[PDB]
Amino acid sequence: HMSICTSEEWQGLMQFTLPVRLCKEIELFHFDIGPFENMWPGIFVYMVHRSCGTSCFELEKLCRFIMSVKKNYRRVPYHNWKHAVTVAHCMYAILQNNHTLFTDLERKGLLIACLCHDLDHRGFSNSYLQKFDHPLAALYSTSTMEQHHFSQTVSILQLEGHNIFSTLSSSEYEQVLEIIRKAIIATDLALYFGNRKQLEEMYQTGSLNLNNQSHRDRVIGLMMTACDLCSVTKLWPVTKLTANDIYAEFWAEGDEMKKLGIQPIPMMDRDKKDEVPQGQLGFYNAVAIPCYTTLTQILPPTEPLLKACRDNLSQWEKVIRGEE
Ligand SMILES: CC(C)c1nc2ccc(OCc3ccc4ccccc4n3)cc2n1-c1ccccc1
Ligand SMILES: [Mg+2]
Ligand SMILES: [Zn+2]
Structure with a gap:
C-alpha cells in the first residue's frame, strides 16, 4: 500500500549531473x-554524495528510493515534493557547515528524514483531521501526520530493491531508524516549544552535553524545525511566493471548514487576506526568530539562517507600514 517508481523514472536519476x-x-x-x-x-x-560520499549508498537503490518518495508525495500547494527537497537542502547546508559534530549515521539518516518528513501529507493540519475527523486521526491521535510520515518512510524502505540501509548491521540499521523517527516526530511544531525552551535552559545554565544522547535528540529536533521553516530564510522575492503556497493550503483547509458551516480561525479564512503581513510578523516574532536564535547559539555556523530571517522580518514590517 505504498506507491513505487517505474524503472525508467529512476534510471533518469542515475544519469543526472548537477550543472557546474x-x-x-x-x-x-x-x-x-x-x-x-x-x-x-x-x-x-x-x-x-557531497556530504556522505559516492559509496555511502548503492547508486541504484538510492535512486529507486528517492523517486518512490517523490511518488508518495501529493500535489497539494505547499506540503509537496518541493518542500521535502527544500527542507533537505537546508539540513544539507546545516551538516556541511558543522562538519565534525555529527556522525556518519546521523548525516545520512537526517537527510533521509528531511526528504521523508512530510510523506503523503494531505494539506490538512493535525488540528483539522482530529478536530473533524479523518481516518488518519483514529490511527495516530498524538502527532497525527508525524507518526504517519515515519510509518510511511519505513514502508518505502521495506520494499524490494529499496532498503538503502541494507549494508548496516542489525544494530546500525536500528539506530538510524531511531534517528529518523525522532527527527520526523520532531517536525511537529507543537513539540518545538518545550524543546527550544529546554535548550535555552540547558544553554544558559551551561549544562548542554552533546555527549548526552537525549541532548543530541534535542539539538537534532531544533535542526529539524529550523529546516522545516526555512521558507522564512530565503531571499525576499522567494520568501513572498512561498508564503503564497502556504496560505493557499491554509485557506483551502479553511474552505473545507466553511463547507460544513464552520468558521475557520482567521489564519485559514481567505476573506481575511490583508491580516497576513500582521500574521507573518507575529509568527516571525513568536516562532521563527526564537528558533534560529537558539540554533545559532548552539551551532554558531548556522548563523546566516538568523540573518536572512531578520531581513524577511523587516520586509514584512514594511509591508505592514506601507512601503514594500
Ligand atoms: C511553517 C508554516 C506552515 C507556517 N506555520 C505557521 C503557523 C502560523 C502562522 O501564522 C501566520 C498568520 C497568523 C495569523 C494570521 C491571522 C490572519 C491572517 C493571516 C495570519 N497568518 C504562519 C505559519 N506558517 C507560515 C510560515 C511562513 C510563511 C507562511 C506561513
Ligand atoms: Mg510536517
Ligand atoms: Zn514540513
Missing part, C-alpha cells in the same frame, strides 16, 4: 530550488 553553475549556489543557506523542478531529485542525490 550551481555548485556554489547549492552551498548557500538562502538557495532557492524553485527554478529547477527537473533537477530536484537529482539535487538530492548530489547533496547526499
